[PDB]
Design an enzyme around this catalytic site. Structure first.
Site, PDB file in Angstrom:
ATOM      1  N   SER A 240      82.322 -48.136 -93.960  1.00  0.00           N
ATOM      2  CA  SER A 240      81.500 -49.021 -94.774  1.00  0.00           C
ATOM      3  C   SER A 240      81.474 -50.458 -94.268  1.00  0.00           C
ATOM      4  O   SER A 240      80.840 -51.305 -94.904  1.00  0.00           O
ATOM      5  CB  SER A 240      81.987 -48.994 -96.226  1.00  0.00           C
TER       6      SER A 240
ATOM      7  N   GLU B 113      74.608 -42.802 -94.911  1.00  0.00           N
ATOM      8  CA  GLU B 113      75.739 -42.453 -95.760  1.00  0.00           C
ATOM      9  C   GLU B 113      75.532 -41.070 -96.372  1.00  0.00           C
ATOM     10  O   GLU B 113      74.424 -40.746 -96.812  1.00  0.00           O
ATOM     11  CB  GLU B 113      75.918 -43.481 -96.872  1.00  0.00           C
TER      12      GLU B 113
HETATM   13  C1  LIG Z   1      82.762 -46.700 -96.850  1.00  0.00           C
HETATM   14  O1  LIG Z   1      83.467 -46.756 -95.894  1.00  0.00           O
HETATM   15  C2  LIG Z   1      82.755 -45.424 -97.711  1.00  0.00           C
HETATM   16  C3  LIG Z   1      82.168 -44.329 -98.191  1.00  0.00           C
HETATM   17  N1  LIG Z   1      83.038 -43.560 -99.091  1.00  0.00           N
HETATM   18  C4  LIG Z   1      84.330 -43.077 -98.627  1.00  0.00           C
HETATM   19  C5  LIG Z   1      85.435 -43.650 -99.510  1.00  0.00           C
HETATM   20  O2  LIG Z   1      86.644 -43.567 -99.150  1.00  0.00           O
HETATM   21  O3  LIG Z   1      85.138 -44.217-100.599  1.00  0.00           O
HETATM   22  C6  LIG Z   1      84.343 -41.534 -98.655  1.00  0.00           C
HETATM   23  C7  LIG Z   1      85.158 -41.007 -97.448  1.00  0.00           C
HETATM   24  C8  LIG Z   1      84.964 -41.003 -99.971  1.00  0.00           C
HETATM   25  S1  LIG Z   1      82.626 -40.918 -98.534  1.00  0.00           S
HETATM   26  O4  LIG Z   1      82.198 -39.911 -97.284  1.00  0.00           O
HETATM   27  O5  LIG Z   1      81.632 -41.315 -99.541  1.00  0.00           O
END
Ligand SMILES: *C(=O)/C=C/N[C@@H](C(=O)O)C(C)(C)S(=O)O
Ligand SMILES: *C(=O)/C=C/N[C@@H](C(=O)O)C(C)(C)S(=O)O
Ligand SMILES: *C(=O)/C=C/N[C@@H](C(=O)O)C(C)(C)S(=O)O
Ligand SMILES: *C(=O)/C=C/N[C@@H](C(=O)O)C(C)(C)S(=O)O
EC number: 3.5.2.6
Lengths: 265, 265, 265, 265
Positions: free
Chosen positions: D42, D140
């Site tokens: 992210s 995403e």
């Molecule tokens: C940003 O890096 C995140 C996206 N979400 C992740 C999180 O740890 O919150 C995951 C791995 C759960 S996801 O694939 O949405």
């Protein structure tokens, strides 16, 4: 019928609760012992800073004030750490509001000048603001330990709320000086368990607390609803029946503020 | 009268407010359109998880369930990431409560088994808790789209509050199963601007939100006072006058919970 | 290495920095001017009340002490408000640790008893803990204003660390008397801008500060890692090249403590 | 010799660690696997917001973006509650940074325009700033589950720290747009236990976090000394040896940040 819940909190905490909220164009004024006299305590430090700001140009905040060891007569968590270096007027205003510094308030009172070390001058600033009942007759920490029934160093929740309304929401100060006081109260570090704890997080709360003997615990504040409507809340209380050593109850102030919040929603 | 304030926010937000707080040994019950029927929306996923825990042992949570891309019908932030791997029952419970996952609820409903994808079995579980009013006839996301006046997939703030009181506070589940249900609702990530926003920060709040068309916005919660006293808060609302695409007002739920907090304080 | 960063802040702040972190089982010992003598200042009050705790039972804390206005000599925010009512033994310990009350410390020295206000009795407790180097000869406010090079009322960063280690981590006091000493140092209100401001927030920090003339600023502290590993940190410093009224630089102590927190992580 | 402590943290947490801090005028550049490739996660949402800010005027932030339930493919705490009303571009930039909203980042990528949902345009914006190493190919949440060794959706701690330096400290954006990005990163709600937990409280820390599978945990940040000196800290890590379901260790990022804080002190 909010007086019933306030009267129940008095029975629960063995205290005398005083609450006033000035009226708005949409809501009526909330009054519980609004015209009764409670002790000023440190709540006088908010109009005291305004008095210093009102009678002095903005350049006066940089005037350095030096003091000795005998000046620290009460808890001064900031004045204690600058006895050798000194302090400007602005640093005295910051410590008196944010940390309730006892020595800073006495030097700010002395900066006002006049008889009584500035007490009579501070009361004159309240009279000019229409305040007709409040009075300050001593310095810290003497003003905190007045016996019950003594009208010295006392105000009313109705009076201190109107004063706080003109300083923050009114035109008692120009926008440049008024923004200094509002920021100082907005960053107060001694009221996390009083009016701030009674109002939800999305409500903005600036405040100045006050504690003294006989279980005294007050907190005057200006609150902003999530939509942006500003309200003034004055909550004061004592436990003079419990004696000089009576322990203040911060939960009573937090519980009363939660009652006020439901009425202002 | 709290009903007067509970009658203003309806006019202020152009909505239909439904509030119910079950009475305790010290406080009376808060009622406002408590027996009026409101749509379940996503709130039914709280008694749905407790249904799977009730009929199935602890080891059933580790049972994996596979599903294709056709089964993803509603908002599913978690189900769209395990289509190739599948999820165990425990993960579908965590996703249905904390993230209001639509596909996980449909899988938990089929996990109950029976006619209409486990809907009649779900209503049957509500009858065992003494709730003979609520009902669930459709699956995600059709239950959110029922027109007003219709009694399908509807419930009342009165009947859903007592159900949550049995599940979280009562003996509807054994302690080890009840601890699992409470933890999921305590870590919910979709109710920050509803009941959680209307109560002070020193109050603990667990909840399960519900949204839908016709301006439907619900939030059933179990809150704890700073002294540890537990209450149940059921707030439901809709704006059918605005039409099918009416916008739900979250601020109405948060503002309603502040009124409840004032009386409960 | 760490000694080069410890040799930079001395030039950055024009001071003489002294750090010592006694070696534990995991990491080594951080030393910089560890055996060079620095003034005790108000840091002697930490082992002072520990000596008053040691040679007297727990019931000795309730003993009342009456005193006059002439006994107030140094700064005394707490002792100056109890001239008529007097203070107890434990009240003098709380005031001397938390608020660094000079009058409370001079009375605690007199409670230990002995010649010259009982300063030899205080040092008569240090060698019993193994401290051979440190010594105390005067009372407030004289111990803070010794000339540089003089050895009276001095200790070393190596000398007061192991005593603080013995008094908080060793077996110098029984558990009943250890809990009180640690709690008083955790509630200290005179060192938010020294070692506490140098370590991250998730590190527990108890400390007792010391400030005097010649730019003298000390802080002995026992910190805890986020995982629970205890460490003893002793940072003393003076500015003996700027005169008797040299300004003490708290920022050097906070920067040095950050330089200690790096290797400890 | 700071690379010795980074290695022990790699040994203790069973993880590969990447750290880069661009050299200021007073200090040097801190590097540890700085030119190694780490997954974006992210962290790409910080320059993505700056990309939309750069390619559009200020009033473009008021454009309302409407989406459906199918657009919620990952965890989106803000976008999930605004499917009915929709979200403005300004609200999408806020949610993508502060709450790391997944749907908001995907919609902003489409607002950039271009092939494959606009990931080619985001990469082209990085090439404009001078970054010739980073790349974004997926959306995403597909960009979070890339296998180790793949260069898809990866950057380097050396490259991401130089990109963040121009966006915040440089002049890649005018002061009006730059103040919006800085304010958004200052009110982040997902990096409390990462770099923010490794620096003393009196240091101002703005940051954007990143987390994915294989124990991936990154956090890019800009910190300010108590005196006001700004530094950029880029900390990335993974645990790809532990497999897909490998748990991330936030304490590794907080402990590495404490090591950098001591060196920058
Ligand atoms: C940003 O890096 C995140 C996206 N979400 C992740 C999180 O740890 O919150 C995951 C791995 C759960 S996801 O694939 O949405
Ligand atoms: C407001 O002006 C406060 C005085 N502080 C009180 C406290 O509770 O700390 C006293 C009266 C005890 S004090 O003189 O420190
Ligand atoms: C919980 O089960 C869902 C309510 N769904 C709404 C939402 O805000 O997510 C809708 C109406 C958008 S939906 O039919 O998914
Ligand atoms: C320990 O309690 C210290 C007193 N030292 C100084 C201080 O700033 O507190 C003085 C100036 C009071 S010392 O006067 O002789």
């Amino acid at each position: 019928d909010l007086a019933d819940r306030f009267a129940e909190l008095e029975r629960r905490y063995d205290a005398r609760l005083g609450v006033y909220v000035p009226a708005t164009g949409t809501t009526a004024a909330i009054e519980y012992r609004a015209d009764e006299r409670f002790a000023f305590c440190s709540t006088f430090k908010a109009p005291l800073v305004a008095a210093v700001l009102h009678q002095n140009p903005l350049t006066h905040l940089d005037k350095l004030i030096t003091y000795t060891s005998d000046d620290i007569r009460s808890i001064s968590p900031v004045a204690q750490q600058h006895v050798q270096t000194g302090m400007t007027i602005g640093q005295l205003c910051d410590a008196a509001i944010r940390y309730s510094d006892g020595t800073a308030a006495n030097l700010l009172l002395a900066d006002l000048g006049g008889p009584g070390g500035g007490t009579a001058a501070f009361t004159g600033y309240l009279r000019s603001l229409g305040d007709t009942v409040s009075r300050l007759d001593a310095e810290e920490p003497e003003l905190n330990r007045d016996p019950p029934g003594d009208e010295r160093d006392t105000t009313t929740p109705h009076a201190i709320a109107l004063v706080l309304q003109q300083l923050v929401l009114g035109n008692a100060l120009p926008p440049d000086k008024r923004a200094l006081l509002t920021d100082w109260m907005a960053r107060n570090t001694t009221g996390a368990k009083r009016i701030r704890a009674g109002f939800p997080a999305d409500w903005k709360v600036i405040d100045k607390t006050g504690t003294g003997d006989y279980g005294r615990a007050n907190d005057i504040a200006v609150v902003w609803s999530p939509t942006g409507v500003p309200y003034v809340v004055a909550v004061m209380s004592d436990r003079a029946g419990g004696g000089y050593d009576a322990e203040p109850r911060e939960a009573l102030l937090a519980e009363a503020a939660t009652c006020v919040a439901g009425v202002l929603a």
